[PDB]
Amino acid sequence: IDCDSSVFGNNFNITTSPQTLTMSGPLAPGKYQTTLTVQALIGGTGVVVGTVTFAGKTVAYQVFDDSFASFDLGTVTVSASTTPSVIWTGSTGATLTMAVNIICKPITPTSVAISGQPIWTTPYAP
Amino acid sequence: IDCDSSVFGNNFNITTSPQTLTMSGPLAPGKYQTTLTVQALIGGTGVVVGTVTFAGKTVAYQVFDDSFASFDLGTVTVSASTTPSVIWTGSTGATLTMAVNIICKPITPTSVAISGQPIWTTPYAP
Amino acid sequence: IDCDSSVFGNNFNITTSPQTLTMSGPLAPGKYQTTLTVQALIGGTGVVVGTVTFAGKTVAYQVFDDSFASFDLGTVTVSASTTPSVIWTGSTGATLTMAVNIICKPITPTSVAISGQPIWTTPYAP
Amino acid sequence: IDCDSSVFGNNFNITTSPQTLTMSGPLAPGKYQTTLTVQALIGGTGVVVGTVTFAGKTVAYQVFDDSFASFDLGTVTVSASTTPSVIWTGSTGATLTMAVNIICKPITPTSVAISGQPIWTTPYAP
Amino acid sequence: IDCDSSVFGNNFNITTSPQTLTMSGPLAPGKYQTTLTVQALIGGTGVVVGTVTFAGKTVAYQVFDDSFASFDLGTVTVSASTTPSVIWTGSTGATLTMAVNIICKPITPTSVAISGQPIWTTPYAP
């Protein structure tokens, strides 16, 4: 019935302000709820600050040792179908592996079940 | 359809009790559901306690090594449009990078789908 | 419209079985959904087990290095308005900083939107 | 109104395949939504794999350094009232403290609020 | 009433691109909401990137020290009953233990309670 799209990428760090075109993501033509998961291991004893821009949105990201963070982001529109992509900034280096996942869902009406019948009603406005 | 606002900031630590005006946040004029994500890497082998005040609300924050914490916070009002900002306190130092993100959503009615029709009803009050 | 109460505390460790009266929490007179966030940094290379009692409820808590854990706890009543407070137990020591946050929400009806109109109904019971 | 039951335990590791009867848990007679929180600190520089069986369900668990994981588990039945208990397996040792929490909730109808009145309806089937 | 299926596995690392047939998972014949939990401890001082493919879906995974990550994934269909299984890729080695859990739920209508009766309605279309 309902659909899904988890577009994803596994990347590296070199230039400040780089794009990362997202792997194997064909399109997200319609409306969607959206989420980010991000984490990045560090080569050596160094700490890394950074920020992640997706679609007019931006996210803070301190790190050292082990990390994992997620973000719900409500109901992003897609005005016209395109490939997913992510711009971001922060310190880069010889070794600082990156892992980033976008998950987006179609918005659908929720099914419901009614309790307490019969249910009161009047023609008149409240 | 629905809107969103993830206002954000990436900062440092010097004075006790400082404000951090939040980056690139124009306004949040209406009612909103709200959330915090906070994490802060440590320069050197030191641990840091701290607390974060947003809007009449305050949050505890122990840390060492790697950290990441989030908080749902229900339905904050915005009486009049302003720039987002965050006051906080705790130990500061030569190196203790900070990363903080606010995400807020408009509150909207949820769409629903009805199951089990036809549905019972009576004019009379229960 | 809807209200909120994030009562909070930032504390230390000395005696077994201590109370910690919670900072700046005036009252929670009515019914509420509730949540805990807890984390505690360790002075030195030591591990700490502990348990946290709130309101007839109790929570397990292993720790070393960095920690952060959260708990939803459904719909706690408040029979009469009081100050928030937390009892707990476990190993204590020279340095083991504690951070604990309670977040509670009023329970309110959810707004809804109806899909699929017109909606079928019959006077007769199913 | 609504009830709750957070049954809990703080334990050790010796035999493979042990039970841990859960502390201070009197009964859960009816239907319930359920959740696990598990974490276990390590004595020494060692890593621990393990799995946790609850009620016909089983859970994977790698660990080293600091850990914390949670699991929603939908709507477990309780055919007849009993004490909570947990079987599990994996490497054990001289020091590997365990912390495990079960939280379960009664399933109740959700209250709702209606938007968009008046609402269309027809006697005829769709 | 409602059912559940937490199929699971605890594994090792050798070849690139291996399958892991999932332990003790008999079938998931119908429609389901789905979730992943993944974490993997590291033998030695090494970091590991990897990606996890389930059902036409793929997930990023940086790691070092301690890790734990989870993913909601909406409403996966099961066209015909089969055993659960997971393909994945990344660096492998002498010691890099893996822990992976799938949790899936039947999709069911939600029960509801009505507030604000009596409820307005008109025969006429809006």
Author numbering:
A (entry chain C), B (entry chain C), C (entry chain C), D (entry chain C), E (entry chain C): 244 to 369
The article reads:
Recently, several unassigned viruses isolated from mosquitoes, including the Omono River virus (OmRV), were identified as totivirus-like viruses, with features similar to those of the Totiviridae family.
The final resolution of the protrusion is 4.10 Å. The backbone model reveals that the protrusion head is composed of a β-jelly roll including eight β-strands in each subunit. Excitingly, the traced first residue of the N-terminus, Ile244, is just located behind the CM-2 motif, which means that the N-terminus of the protrusion is released from the ORF1-encoded precursor. The full atomic model of the protrusion pentamer reveals a channel throughout the middle of the protrusion. The C-terminal residues Pro349 to Pro369 compose the stem, where two β-cylinder structures are formed. The C-terminus of the stem interacts with the tip of the MCP-A, whereas there is no direct interaction between the protrusion and the MCP-B. Only one hydrogen bond was found between Thr365 of each protrusion subunit and Thr1125 of MCP-A, and no salt bridge could be identified.
